[PDB]
Amino acid sequence: VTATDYDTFVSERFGSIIQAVQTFTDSTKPGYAFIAAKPKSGLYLTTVQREDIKNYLKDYNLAPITPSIISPNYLFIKTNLKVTYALNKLQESEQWLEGQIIDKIDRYYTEDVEIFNSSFAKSKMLTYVDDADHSVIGSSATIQMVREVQNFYKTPEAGIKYNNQIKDRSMESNTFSFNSGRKVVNPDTGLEEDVLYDVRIVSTDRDSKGIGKVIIGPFASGDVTENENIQPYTGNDFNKLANSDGRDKYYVIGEINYPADVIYWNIAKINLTSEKFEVQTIELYSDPTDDVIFTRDGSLIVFENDLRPQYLTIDLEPISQLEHHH
Amino acid sequence: ATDYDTFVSERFGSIIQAVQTFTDSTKPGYAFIAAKPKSGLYLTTVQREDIKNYLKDYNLAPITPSIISPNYLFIKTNLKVTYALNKLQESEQWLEGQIIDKIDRYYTEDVEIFNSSFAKSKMLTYVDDADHSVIGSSATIQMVREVQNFYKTPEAGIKYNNQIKDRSMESNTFSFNSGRKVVNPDTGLEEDVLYDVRIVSTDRDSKGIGKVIIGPFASGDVTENENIQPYTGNDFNKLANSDGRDKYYVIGEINYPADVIYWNIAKINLTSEKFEVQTIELYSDPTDDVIFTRDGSLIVFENDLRPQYLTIDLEPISQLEHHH
């Protein structure tokens, strides 16, 4: 028993295609012993869905509790890097240089951060970035935590957490398409099926107890049917998106507990069927109050640029030389 | 029992002196381990959280065994030892000490153990054994179950694992708070009159059942509607008064032969609020002079901490026209 004993158990019987193990138990889900497992190479163990996470299932000793071999709950860092260097000090291209900083940004992660109950610090990685040339003068960054959400429709039973604290309104997802039942025409073309607009999930400033709503919109006046319950969110209090289509009526569908660090929603709370949504998986961005981001139970801060390039933009800036004369 | 108790009995043998597991027919799913500190009576909630946190050590995710303190059965002993003047060197105060040790040495060795039992005949031979001058003893016992909540018996019941006599079951006294004002300038302008009260049992019926009734009231401060009306039987023990109080009422009932005791004050519209206690003690005379333990019950002599459950009368003898 004991998660620690189990972590080993697997750092042996598998200690081949596995880099790390976190055996934690969830207080919401009794009798279930959860086993986080980093593939040591990629991200998901049998993304093929078990091929692997079923083999470990097939390891049994004692107890009335049952294993649930999962892939680690990944925290991502959407970094907007802005390194600046000296035109002259540089001998190879900006292209070769990028491939030089991300070689470092990786060295940091995989040595200090990509570990269980281990953490990430922006200041500490920007030291690694700075440390890629004779110049390279300095560097800026703007990060957000990312949680990848399977089934956009609704969060888990027990909500999703970051293992970190975010700021008011900080929480927002990427946009996805909502197929309004309605139909419209332009450019000599026809019905064009059903009108679609870009819609998304955002949080609101916390109330006097640490608790804002999780709202979704915009909409039409519209494509969502209003009840005694279902009513457009009452007031400004968050981040609205570009109505290049003019729209705006958002609806409440959950809440963030900022202090408790839990976020729940369920689109079924209004009456939209997942059919009315193109997507399956979405991204949930928030920006921390943390100058240090903590991983934790089954959570793991990882940097996989190749397979997750989207989570890193590098904007370089070249600089004129100074005094060359003496 | 020992399947898991023993282990625990290894990593903690320096405190726990008694460990046994059991289930509750009823609290299905739950497995409890009673443990008695070698060092007294109740393990401390820190001693308890440590011991529970070896449950993780041995991996089990299911809610896993509740550790808890043993269900104690106490013997209120009323001892009498008659001894020879000539042959007794030290003080009477010494002699007592000398025997009150023997009692404990018998309890520790033959009694304080799970499902082991107390035999009044044995411990008396221990008493006899305490000095070369302790000519002969006698002894009168009662059973004490220490009740966690006075207001209602457990869902299931309270049992002694032993046969008691009629009218025998009787708790001690606890203040009931009527609600009237007294108007006394001695202590201000208002005391809130509160008179003692106990909970006794009455005589077996045709069929083996008694009624668990509750001490004296003053008509008014208990509301009676047809159904809930004063008990009338005189088949129980009433208590010492100075007040005009003779109205006892009926809650639960004793099943003498199956020894189960259920009661619930609620059966008379009286909230816990109304009584200034939270814990009580239930006494009762055994049928026999050999008394038993069963599931998670443990019999124990902890006399520097429950001194109220032993009294010693000595009788010094010489020669002799008289020893009472």
What is the SS3 assignment for chain A? CCHHHHHHHHHHHCCCCCCEEEEEECCCCCCEEEEEEECCCCCCCCCCCCCCCCCCCCCCCCCCCEEEEECCEEEEEEEEEEEEEECCCCCCCHHHHHHHHHHHHHHHHHHHHCCCCCEECHHHHHHHHHCCCCCCCEEECCEEEEEEECCCCECCCCCECCCCCECCCCCEECCEEEECCCCCCCCCCCCCCCCEEEEEEEECCCCCCCEEEEEEECCCCCCCCCCCCCCECCCCCCCCCCCCCCCCCCEEEEEEECCCCEEEEEHHHCCCCHHHECCCCEEEEECECCCCEECCCCEEECCCCCCCCCCEEECCCEECCCCCCC
Beta strands in B189-256, from DSSP E residues, in sequence order:
192-195, 199-201, 212-214, 249-251, 253-255
One domain for residues B49 and B180: no
Q: At what angle do helices A122-130 and A94-108 cross, to 10 degrees?
A: 140
A219: nearest Cα among A238, A247, A241, A243: A247
Reading the block at residue B323, the tokens are 């020893």
Distance CA B201, CA B204 (A): 9
Pair A262, A123: CB distance under 8 Å: no
Residues of B with Cβ-Cβ distance to A3 under 8 angstroms: 56, 59
Q: Chain B contacts of A62, Cβ < 8 Å? A: 59
Tokens representing residue A186 in the block: 């332009």
Resolution of this entry, Å: 16.0
Using CA atoms in the order B97, B102, B108, B113, what is the torsion angle rounded to 10 degrees?
Answer: -120
Rounded-to-integer distance, Cα A186 and Cα A195, Å: 11
Q: For B146-265, where are the alpha helices, taking DSSP H only?
A: none
The Cα B5–Cα B9 span in angstroms is 6
User: Do A18 and A160 fall into the same domain?
Assistant: no
Contact of B80 with B137, CB cutoff 8 Å: yes
Question: B114 and B36 share a domain?
Answer: no
C-alpha pair distances (Å), A287 with each of A143, A232, A241, A283, B233: 7, 26, 17, 13, 77
How many inter-chain contacts (A to B, CB under 8 Å) are there? Answer: 36
Judgement on whether residues A98 and A56 belong to the same structural domain of the protein: no
Residues in chain B within 8 Å Cβ distance of A66: 61
The answer to whether A63 contacts B62, with C-beta atoms less than 8 Å apart, is yes
Distance CA A78, CA A242 (A): 21
**Spatial CA neighbour of A155 closest among A119, A203, A205:** A203
**In this structure, are A218 and A259 located in the same domain?**
yes
Same structural domain for residues B261 and B179? yes
Query: What's at A52, amino acid-wise?
Result: D
DSSP state of B234: -
- The nearest CA of chain A is from the CA of B1 a distance in Å of 18
Closest CA to A198 of A150, A152, A244: A244
A31: left (phi over 0), alpha (psi -120 to 50) or beta: left
Structure tokens at B14: 């320096």
Cα–Cα distance measured from residue A251 to residue A232, given in angstroms and rounded to the nearest whole number = 5
CATH of the domain at A38: 3.30.300.200
B172 alpha-carbon distance from chain centroid: 10
Residue in chain A nearest B54 by alpha carbon: A2
Cα distance between the two ends of chain A: 72
Of A126, A223, A225, A131, the C-alpha closest to A177 is: A223
Q: State the pairing for strand pair B199-201/B253-255.
A: unpaired
Task: Tell me if A145 sits within 8 A of A164, measured CB to CB.
Answer: yes
Residues linked to residue B142 through DSSP beta bridges, in sequence order: B76
Residue of B nearest to A30 (CA): B62
From chain B residues 44-73, the ones with a CB under 8 A of any chain A CB are 56-63
| Structural contact between residues B82 and B135, judged by C-beta atoms closer than 8 angstroms | yes
Helix (H) or strand (E) holding B9: helix B2-11
The tally of CA atoms less than 13 A away on the side-chain side of residue B240 is 2
Of A280, A232, A286, A291, nearest in space to A258 by CA: A286
- Domain of residue A313: give its range: 72-326
Distance CA B46, CA B44 (A): 5
Peptide bond just before B216 cis, omega within 30 deg: no
**Measured between CA atoms, how close is B55 to chain A, in angstroms?**
8
- CB neighbour class for B208 (10 Å; exposed up to 12, middle 13-18, buried from 19): exposed
Boundary residue ending a domain (A52, A71, A90): A71
Residue B87 at interface with chain A, using a CB cutoff of 8 Å: no
Cα–Cα distance, A23 to B29 (Å, whole number): 25
Report whether A256 contacts A214 (CB < 8 A): yes
Q: Please give the order of strands across the beta sheet that includes A66-70.
A: A20-25, A32-38, A66-70
Instruction: Please state, in angstroms and rounded to a whole number, the distance separating the CA atoms of residues A264 and A213.
Output: 9
Cα angle B82, B83, B88; round to 5: 155
Give the residue from chain B lying closest to A34, CA to CA: B61
Boundary of a domain, candidates B38, B69, B100: B69
Picking from B59, B63, B64 by the largest number of A CB atoms within 10 A of its own CB, the best residue to mutate is B59
Q: Is the peptide bond before A235 cis (omega within 30 degrees of 0)?
A: no
CB neighbour list of residue A114: distance below 8 Å, 6 or more residues apart: A38, A300, A301, A302, A303
B58 token code pair: 């041995």
- Residue B305 touches partner A, C-beta closer than 8 Å: no
Number of domains in chain B: 2
Coil, strand or helix at B254: strand
Q: Does the CB of A4 have a partner CB in chain B at under 8 Å?
A: no
Q: How far is CA A37 from CA A24, A44, A145, A148, A312, in A?
A: 11, 8, 21, 17, 24
Q: Contact, B274 vs B177, CB < 8 A?
A: yes
Is residue A25 less than 8 Å (CB to CB) from chain B? Answer: yes
Pair (B90, B10) in one structural domain: no
**Within B12-52, where are the H helices?**
45-52
B50 and B112 belong to one structural domain: no
Contact A33 B61 (CB under 8 A): yes
Distance, CA of B194 to CA of B93 (rounded, Å): 39
End residue of a domain, out of A11, A43, A71: A71
Query: Rounded CA gap, A215 and A251, in Å?
Result: 5
Tokens of A284: 């949930």
Burial label, A160 (beta-carbon count in 10 A; 0-12, 13-18, 19+): middle
Residue B254 vs residues A3, B24, B154, B198, B289: alpha-carbon distances, Å: 49, 20, 14, 15, 21
Contact B59 A30 (CB under 8 A): no
CB contact under 8 A, A1 and B63: no
With CA atoms as reference, report the closest residue to B309 among B172, B200, B191, B179.
B172
Select from B182, B176, B286 the least CA-distant residue to B239. Answer: B176
> Is residue B31 domain-shared with residue B125, that is, in the same domain?
no
Q: Is the peptide bond before A81 cis (omega within 30 degrees of 0)?
A: no
Interatomic CA distance for residues A230 and B270, integer angstroms: 46
Residue ranges of E strands in chain B: 16-23, 31-37, 66-68, 71-84, 118-119, 136-147, 170-171, 176-181, 192-195, 199-201, 212-214, 249-251, 253-255, 260-262, 280-283, 290-291, 297-299, 310-317
Contacts of B63 in chain A (CB under 8 A): 30-31
Is B108 found in the same domain as B84? yes
Q: Which residues of B touch A6 (CB under 8 A)?
A: 59
Measure the CA dihedral B79/B84/B88/B92, to 10°: 40
Query: Residue B123 is inside which H or E element, if any?
Result: helix B120-128
Among B56, B59, B62, the residue with its CB nearest the CB of A30 is B62
> Which tokens sit at A187?
């450019």
Enter the tokens of residue B41: 């009576």
Cα(A242)–Cα(A285) distance, integer angstroms: 18
Exposed / middle / buried, residue A164 (Cβ in 10 Å: 0-12, 13-18, 19+):
buried
Tell me how the structure was determined.
cryo-EM
Give A318: exposed, middle or buried? Use CB within 10 Å, 0-12, 13-18, 19+: exposed
Check whether the bond before A262 is cis (ω within 30° of 0). no
User: Across the interface, do A1 and B59 touch by the CB < 8 Å criterion?
Assistant: yes
Residues A40 and A115 in one domain: no
Residues A277 and A134 occupy one common structural domain? yes
Cβ–Cβ contacts within 10 Å for residue B73, how many?
22
